[PDB]
From a paper:
After crystal screening and optimization, crystal structures of [name][L] and KlCESH[L] were successfully resolved at 1.94 Å and 2.02 Å, respectively. Two molecules are present in a crystal asymmetric unit, and gel filtration experiments showed that both enzymes form homodimers in solution. However, sulfate ions, from the crystallizing solutions, were observed in the catalytic pockets of [name][L] after the co-crystallization with CES. The residues involved in sulfate ion binding, including D18N, Q20, T133, N134, K164, and Y192 from the core domain, as well as R55 and R59 from the cap domain, formed a polar substrate binding pocket that was well-suited for binding small, highly hydrophilic molecules. Activity assays revealed a decrease in [name][L] activity with increasing sulfate ion concentration, indicating that sulfate ions can compete for the binding site during catalysis. However, the binding of non-catalytic ligands, including sulfate ions and products L-TA, did not cause significant structural changes.
Microbial epoxide hydrolases, cis-epoxysuccinate hydrolases (CESHs), have been utilized for commercial production of enantiomerically pure L(+)- and D(−)-tartaric acids for decades. All these three CESH[L]s exhibit high sequence identity (>60%) with L-2-haloacid dehalogenases, which are members of the haloacid dehalogenase (HAD)-like superfamily.
Residue numbers in the entry:
A (entry chain A), B (entry chain B): 11 to 247
The structure:
Amino acid sequence: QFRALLFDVQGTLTDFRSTLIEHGLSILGDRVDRELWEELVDQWRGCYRDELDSLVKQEKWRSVRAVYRDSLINLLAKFSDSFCATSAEVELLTDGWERLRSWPDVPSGLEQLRSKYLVAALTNADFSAIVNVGRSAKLQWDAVLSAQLFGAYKPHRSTYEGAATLLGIAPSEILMVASHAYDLEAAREVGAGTAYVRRPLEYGPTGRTEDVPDGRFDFLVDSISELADQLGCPRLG
Amino acid sequence: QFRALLFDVQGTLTDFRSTLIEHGLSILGDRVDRELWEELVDQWRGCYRDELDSLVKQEKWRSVRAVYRDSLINLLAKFSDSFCATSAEVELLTDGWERLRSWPDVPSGLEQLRSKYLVAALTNADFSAIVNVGRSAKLQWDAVLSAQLFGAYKPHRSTYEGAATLLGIAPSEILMVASHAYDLEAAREVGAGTAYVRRPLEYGPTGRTEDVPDGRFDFLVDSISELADQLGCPRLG
């Protein structure tokens, strides 16, 4: 049925929240309290989402590193009374988004899938960032794809379709894999299969994630290994 | 000194000649003699080269799969007194260029290199072709880059510079690895380092060799593992 599996990375395969909390607290130390920082991280992601949403609607693309950097700068102003940072520290903090760690099932799951399928990333993050995340999150791919290559972010159709063209396959031959429903709904619009991965801790132990019922998407799993098992991929030794 | 290595793939890492000889004989069987099929493969590589040379001069890009397919159709007409092939066999033979096997040093050389460097493919072949060749040749990349992403073949500057900016890396921090002098001299012009890999059997025992003496390029080696050793990579037991 499918020839390739295309993956969202931030959240779906990576624990961004934990990564940035600890990264930040290591750059900043006692200048900041964990609870303020965690709240900042939560707002930083929100800012990212809002800016991308605006950009998508305006049919524009910009460096995601810049999006992240500029949102941190704005947030630092909001929180100026509590702590401060240098421009050099801004660059270091922003780097955390390129040092994402993976959820425990990811490396092995992805490897299991490769017995039967090509695996590729389709990310909104810039090409350089995904290459970097490969090392921090231990992801091995057949291909790496980014919005930067198409000049458009997901959910735009061009992304998914462009990936297909690049991979020499029809969109119907792609299974999109994501823990964000908007991504899967846009993939289904171009004919792809959809696989939702539940990440209950994506937004922290007290966070609220999307509740997805059985039947909305083709697959509904709690780990990439589980998805590989449901697609009939043999197990690793 | 370097953050990443960018590699030519066909010939540099892959024994395309042996691949397409055994692949064609596997498909055509006894309908063609081995020595005739070998001469066809050499002319087929020659047609690809002349065609790309022509397109580079015209600032044009076209699918490399269609380049191999059309030139094979032409060669079949010239050899049509001797053997024949169906339209389905044309497509199966052309697939040979997406099933390239690697030289024996290559899979473990690439692995040793990854301990200190990012490694990426920069190929004239279509994106899907290099993705398929990763399975047949056993190549694992941090990134795969193709002339198809840039609309231009190597040696155009825009391919190396495009690779550099997508990776977010200064060209002076990229080492280009190739067994073809034209490729390394082109990379040198954009500021990259150069590593020449001698492949005495690329065009078979009686082939057109360009001799490179020492000092023409930054590195001159006989295997990717030797290159890894010269870059100070630990050997992996």
